[PDB]
Design a protein around this nucleic acid. Sequence first.
DNA 1: TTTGGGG
DNA 2: TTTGGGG
Lengths: 446, 446
Amino acid sequence: YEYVELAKASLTSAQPQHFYAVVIDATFPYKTNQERYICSLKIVDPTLYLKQQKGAGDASDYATLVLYAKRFEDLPIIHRAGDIIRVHRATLRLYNGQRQFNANVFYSSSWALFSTDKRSVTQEINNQDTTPFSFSSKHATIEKNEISILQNLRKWANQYFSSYSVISSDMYTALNKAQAQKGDFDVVAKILQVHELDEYTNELKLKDASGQVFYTLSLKLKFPHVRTGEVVRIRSATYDETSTQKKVLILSHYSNIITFIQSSKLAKELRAKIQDDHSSLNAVVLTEVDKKHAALPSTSLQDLFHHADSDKELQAQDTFRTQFYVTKIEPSDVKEWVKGYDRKTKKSSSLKGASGKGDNIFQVQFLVKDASTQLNNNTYRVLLYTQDGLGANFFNVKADNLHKNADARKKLEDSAELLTKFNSYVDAVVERRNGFYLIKDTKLIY
Amino acid sequence: YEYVELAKASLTSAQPQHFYAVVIDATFPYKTNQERYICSLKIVDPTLYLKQQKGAGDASDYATLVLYAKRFEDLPIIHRAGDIIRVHRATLRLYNGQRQFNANVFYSSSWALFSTDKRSVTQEINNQDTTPFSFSSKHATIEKNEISILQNLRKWANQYFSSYSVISSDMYTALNKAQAQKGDFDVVAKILQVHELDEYTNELKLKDASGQVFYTLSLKLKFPHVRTGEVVRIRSATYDETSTQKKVLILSHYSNIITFIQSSKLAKELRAKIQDDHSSLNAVVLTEVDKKHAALPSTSLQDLFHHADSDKELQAQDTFRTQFYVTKIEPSDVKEWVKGYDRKTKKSSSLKGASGKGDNIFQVQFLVKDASTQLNNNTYRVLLYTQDGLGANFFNVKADNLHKNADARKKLEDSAELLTKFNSYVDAVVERRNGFYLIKDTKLIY
DNA sequence: TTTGGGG
DNA sequence: TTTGGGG
């Protein structure tokens, strides 16, 4: 078996071609006629892909794929944009100005789906994987020459989705423009809530960039992968005219609810911008980030400490945002949280000597964790070192000699408790400085 | 390394012992004192386990385990009751009348968590696994002699949870009795809704057997595994006295939200009994099961067709309940849905001959799928064969010659469309009969 | 695999 | 591993 890249496939329906590609869109498998099923997809690869960060996408920068079968069960069900598909025996032809690969599974063509995500669903562990999780033939195995192809496409897919939006603005309609649509349309939104209306009827509360909120019923039997907080792209939805209270989206037998691979820049972006207008301390965010960082995407501790100098994005920037819960604060002695600092030697020192140099700072360490790291036994440190102003206002308390000022000390002691004993978490912006992440432009709201 | 079963471990804190066990309860890791962290667990194994189906549990039928460490990161975070833990160098002593295993991770003891679930979270694929997903040492590998131990304990765990409730009534308080509790208490309920109140603040709408509804905020960073429709056991929750509109549960730094392994009988049971009182066709249930089957647990197509004659429960019973969506209905010709039947020869025949024997029946086949099977390419058939009454009323239409009665035919033709083109699903009770599942006591409500 | 392909 | 263990 020899594979060719999408942009290099020969233009013919005479010689069977094979390839590995990244899926960016897919309908659910559906009956188009009697004894004739179809699954339509949009695919990209290193030789053919979308490069815009925003706005319309160039239709000549991605290719399509139409899979044909005579039974529903022979077609693939694709949940995640960013996953990989391997097709054996496909033809290529031009349709509506695009490279359109075709493949009759009912003849001798086959397909196989490979997971592109490195970590698990909860983002908690590493799942690194040379075998398809879903495939058309009984031939559930891969060849040697394929290994490198799959491994490289995965790496590329992740790098690609983390660098580009991939899904362009013409591939969806803002919800505020939905009621006005003639027929069906696509949606890119964040799932704000999942409500079980019946054992397998999950009502999804959707919200997109336009700030409009819609609801839709998703069949749990088909889409057991959707969960609260995730961003999805709905392929084909129509507006329910008979919706009076809630604005409702209706899905069809060919509609698909597509998630994005974890590295997706578009998803990270949307998870950050979209919030739900809603309405004894437990599991609440304890901080407030300067508004100037409002639309800044969050980075997991996993990416922050293990891929920092390993990405064509992270190694470039110095300011990040992340969320975590504090497992411990050091120094243990809160009185030592505020120290004396010498500008000339950049040396800190206890204030238990009663010095009065005035220049006091904070030098606190937070041992933290988040979902991407809590299952491992590493320690991750985030610093609150203010000799240069970064994080100066975190505690909403001036850096005074805590050996003398008893109130400031107790105030800080409460904060320590607050940061570690109520399932609460920190949302902070940090700046890399000499191999350390220092908190900045972030302050407690408690 | 030699391992001993829980009930056979020597009663001493002198010789270090090692074991593999099934976790049925665990607190989140927490700081109990300065430089001293703890994780408390309840464990069982083939030699020591709970056998009641309902009511109080015998405290001498399970053992406890207390893990000690000097830092948070050295203790395990356990999400799923039913998962397996391997402990190296543990001591055993009697405490409050129970076998209590102890282990100092800060000394030389270690732990390792092994997934007991055969299929993935979505229940969509097979994840069968000889390596821990979480562990205390850098020694992330298992030995040869261990392989059999782990494989056997897994098999046992699943068989155990599918046969017993495991979690007894004394291990939780019904929500209708919660407000009256003195201090903290435990909860076993179904998650009816997950609502994102903040990037990492997920509000859970809980409902238990007592029919009372409570809400609680779960920190997504700690519990990224909870999802709508699943049953959980909350270890340590207190009632929020300051809750006026919603009845709220408050969790602490040591509280844990525990799910159950898929085979859990208790979970299957609760997912079936608990519904939420809520308030253009899409993703709705199309049928109604006779009320006499109201508290009957559902069985996935996966279990129905691949483990049917492979379980110490399924091979015993003949009547099941399951949910699925129809991908195709056969015969293709709806007119052939109703045939003539000869009682003596048990032979069916087309009615296109205009025979008037009166005895007409339905002999329809539904090619179906559900989350446990949609990703595979097998076909699963459920029958609606009424020669013996089973399923006689499914269609709410008498079995008439569809070659003559044009209205009955069209009525059935609409049903075919309804069963296959609106993301809707069937909830039906079936009886195994000669290697086939025939629908019974189920009828369309559309 | 000249089907249907945004159904 | 005589800690603390339902915290």
